[PDB]
């Protein structure tokens, strides 16, 4: 499946991520690509042999902007570093 946080078990590599098609090219022997800090940035589709990038799903910290309990009980929430599309 592509573009949905999913559990990915390309043979030999187990991870949770959003699997998207990628432009970087692996040499024929290479299976899973890796990036600085040693994380599994990309995997090669075993059956279709295409480079499928792996990205971790959305994470961040909610913060509550409150006028003050005395002034009001209405609140706002800033979901830090997330894209409005994935908030709900």
């Amino acid at each position: 499946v592509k573009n949905k946080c999913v559990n990915f078990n390309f043979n030999g590599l187990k991870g949770t991520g959003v699997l998207t098609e990628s432009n970087k090219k692996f040499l024929p022997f290479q299976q899973f690509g890796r990036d600085i800090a040693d994380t599994t940035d990309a995997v090669r589709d075993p059956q279709t042999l295409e480079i499928l990038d792996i990205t971790p799903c959305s994470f961040g910290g909610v913060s509550v902007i409150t006028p003050g309990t005395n002034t009001s009980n209405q609140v706002a929430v800033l979901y830090q570093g997330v894209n409005c599309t994935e908030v709900p």
Binding site: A37, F59, G60, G61, Q80, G81
Partner: peptide, 22 residues
């Protein structure tokens, strides 16, 4: 500005005063 030049739970929060107000 030219000369001087995502993770496992480590997020860099943004600076409150944008560099266009500084």
């Amino acid at each position: 500005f030219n000369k001087v030049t995502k993770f496992k739970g480590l997020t860099v929060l943004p600076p409150l005063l944008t560099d266009e107000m500084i």
